[PDB]
Amino acid sequence: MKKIAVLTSGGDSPGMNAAVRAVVRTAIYNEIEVYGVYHGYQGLLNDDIHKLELGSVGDTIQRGGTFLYSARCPEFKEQEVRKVAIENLRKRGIEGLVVIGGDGSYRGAQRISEECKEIQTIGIPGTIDNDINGTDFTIGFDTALNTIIGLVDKIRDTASSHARTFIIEAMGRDCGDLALWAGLSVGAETIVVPEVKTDIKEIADKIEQGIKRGKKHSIVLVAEGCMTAQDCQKELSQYINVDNRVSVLGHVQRGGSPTGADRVLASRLGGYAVDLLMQGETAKGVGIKNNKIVATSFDEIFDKFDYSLYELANKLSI
Template sequence: MKRIGVLTSGGDSPGMNPAIRAVVRKAIFHNIEVYGIYGGYTGLINGNIKKLELGSVGDIIHRGGTMLHSARCPEFKNPEVRQKGIENLKAHGIEGLVVIGGDGSYRGAKALTEQGFPCVGIPGTIDNDIPGTDVTIGFDTALNTVIEAIDKIRDTATSHERTFIIEVMGRDAGDIALWAGLAGGAETILIPEENYDMNEIAERLRKGQERGKKHSIIIVAEGVCSGTEFAKQLKEATNLDTRVSVLGHIQRGGSPTAADRVLASRLGARAVELLIEGKGGRAVGIENNRLVDYDIIEALSKEHKLDLQLYKLSQELSI
C-alpha cells in the first residue's frame, strides 16, 4: 500500500487531532503517502482531498476538535453516492481509508468495505458507546470537563443551599453521566439504560435534609429527559427550589487530556499497521490496556453495554 486517506466524521471529540497526527506520521515513517479528506463523508463525495505532510500535523496534538473538520452526511447511505466517494479516492491513488468517528462513521466505513474499499475505524466519540473497546477517544477529556463543571456548580449549590440539576450529553449512552456523577459525588444520576423512580429520588433527598444536608447535585443524561423537564417533575414531587445547568457542547471542546492523546496515538498508529498488513474492514480498540482489532461489521452488530456495577456503586455511595 502506497497511499492512504484519513477522515473524521460525525460529532467532533477531543483527541481526534492526535489520532490524525498518529495516522499521518506513522504512515510517512513507513514511506506511505497520506491524504486528508476534509469535511467527513461530505468532503469525500465532493472530492475535498489534499495531501498531508509531516508539517501538516505539526502543533495539533494539544488541540481539540479536528483539523480535517467534520459534517453529518445522510446521503452517504446511498450506494451510488458512496461509489462516487470511492471513485474520488481512486482518482488520488488512495488504496485504504482510516475513519475516525462514532457509530454513524463506522456504518459509513462498513458500507465502503462492503463495496470493496478497505477501511479501518478508530473510535472517536465522547459518548464512549462503541462496542469492542473499553474507552473511546474523547471520553476522558469530556468526563474531566463535566467533573470540573460539577465541582464549580457545587460551590454555588452549597452557598445558596439549593439542589442543582446538571444536564450532560448522552442521547443513547449514560457513560458521561454515570462516570461524572460518581466522580463528582452526585446524589442522583439518571441514565438512559435505567428507569428512575421519582419517589425514591424524593425519599433520598428527604433523608439528606433530615441529617442536615442542604444542597444536592443531580446529573441527568440528555437521553433521559431535559434538565428543565426533570426540574418540573422534581418540583411537583418535592416542592424543592432547584436550578438547572445545561453543559451542552462545552463537553466536546477543549485540549485533550494526556490519556486521550496517548490513546489516540496508539490507535492511530495501529490503524495504519492494519492497512499495511492488508487488513481492511477492521476497527481498532483497547481492552485491558491492550490494543485489539475486530471486524467492523461484527462490531456494529453488538450493543454497547454500560457497567451497571458502577451505577449500583453510585447509588450505594449517595445515601
C-alpha cells in the first residue's frame, strides 16, 4: 500500500470534505501518496484523477459539500464500463480506493474489489439518510438534524400568528430517523415516518383536539419516505381545516458547514479507512457502532428504528 485514491459519490452530505481531508493527511502522514478522483465515479472513467498534497485539503474541514465533485454514473452498473475505471487506477499504480457516500456508492466499490483483487476498497458513510448498516450514525445526520431545527425556527419567526400548522418535509429517503430526531427536537406534535402506520384521522384528531384548545402553533414533521408535504396537507383537509405553511425543506439540508459531531466523525473514519488499507483489508464499510469505530463487510452491509424514541416523542407533546 503506497498509492491511495479517494472519491465522493452520490447526494452530498456535510463532513464529506472533513472526511477527505482526514484521508489525505493520514495517508501522507504514513508516506502514502494520494490521488483525488474528481466528479465521483464519472471522473473515475474520465480519468479525472489528481495527486493531492497536504495543502490541497487546507481550509476544508468546515467546508460544506465536496471539493472533488460528485456525479451520478448509472452506466457504472456495467462490468464493461467498470473495466475502464479499473484500468485508469491500475495504470497509475493505485492499490487502494476510498469511497465516501451512500450505500449506492458502496456498491461499485464492492464491484471493484471482486473484479480486481489488487485494488483494496473501503467505504465511508457520507450521507444524511442514516440508512447504512453497521453504523449507528452517518456523516451528515447531525448537521441535517440541526439544519432542520434551524429552518423550522425561521419559519416560526417569519410567520404571522394565524397559521398554526407547519407541515414540514424532512429528507430521510426510506429512513425515519431525521424526521424523528428533528420532530422531537422542535417539539413537533406529530411525526410521520415509513416505520409507523400513519393514522391521519388520529393526527388531525390531535391538531383539532389541541388548537381550538388554545396553543400557538402545532408542527408536523414528515419523512419524505412516507409522503410529500403536499400529500399530507391534502390528506389532512379531508378531515379538518388546515391550509397553513407546507414547507418543503429539500436540498438546503445537504448544504452548510458540518457540525462538530460530523467533523469529528468524518475525521475519525477517514483516518480509520486509511489504517484498514494499511492493514491489508478490503470491501468493508467503516462506521461507529456502540460508540466503537468499526468495520463491516459490504456483504453484511447489504444482507434500526427506535419505536421507543418515537413513542417518547409523542409522550412529550401534551
